[PDB]
């Protein structure tokens, strides 16, 4: 495609395709500095994997969930988002409610394996 971050100024619909390109390259004064950045790299990465895990998205690149889109977050249509705004434009507009939706995905996953546990009781 375009490379690493190649579709940063592209529409959210075009950048959403081939997301495995920004998924690969995500993971003594010189020595201590270099080892300092090596440990931090694994920490920031595992935090994202920790989040994807407690959402049911562990292993997913595109992951649909149960939480409905509250129009208080953004009253924009799908067409005026994915075919117009860029991924950097979008999450500045959602920046406030981003911490609210992280909590919603976690309860929708703990109230999904708990309903799944009763399902396999029969």
């Amino acid at each position, epitope marked *: 495609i375009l490379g690493f971050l190649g579709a940063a100024g592209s529409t959210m619909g075009a950048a959403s395709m081939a997301l495995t390109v920004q998924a690969r390259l995500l993971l003594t004064v010189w020595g201590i500095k270099q080892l300092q950045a090596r440990v931090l790299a694994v920490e920031r990465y595992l935090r994202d994997q920790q989040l994807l895990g407690i959402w049911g998205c562990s292993g997913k690149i595109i992951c649909c969930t149960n939480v409905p889109w509250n129009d208080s977050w953004s009253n924009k249509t799908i067409n005026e988002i994915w*075919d117009n705004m860029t991924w950097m434009q979008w999450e500045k507009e959602i920046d406030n409610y981003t911490q609210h939706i992280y909590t919603l995905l976690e309860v929708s996953q703990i109230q999904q394996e708990k309903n799944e546990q009763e399902l396999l009781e029969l």
Partner: nanobody
Amino acid sequence: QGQLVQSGATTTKPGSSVKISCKTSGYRFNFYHINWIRQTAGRGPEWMGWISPYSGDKNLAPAFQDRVIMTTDTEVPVTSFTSTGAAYMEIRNLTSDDTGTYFCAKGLLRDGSSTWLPYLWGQGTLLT
């Protein structure tokens, strides 16, 4: 979400050629096409043609293909998503039939099937 101011009301006589400007602001000028529409006294509205400030690509109706001179500048960036550009409009064989109000119109989206649709209009310029 920006302004598309145009030139004044310049009135010449048939046979000549008139230049019309279209200065943009408040939006990424390269991300959206610039359409040109007119409403003459004799017909209704008539689509002339749009131009791509990014691809440099032009598409214009066959009724205005061998008359229209259509160009753009290159945007002067203000911020990360703001810029300032300009689109220009000229005509060849001018008559009093082409007398009417002319505006420029920025495109609707950046992808899909209604990309160029004239959404954000200018102000209007009265010809001869």
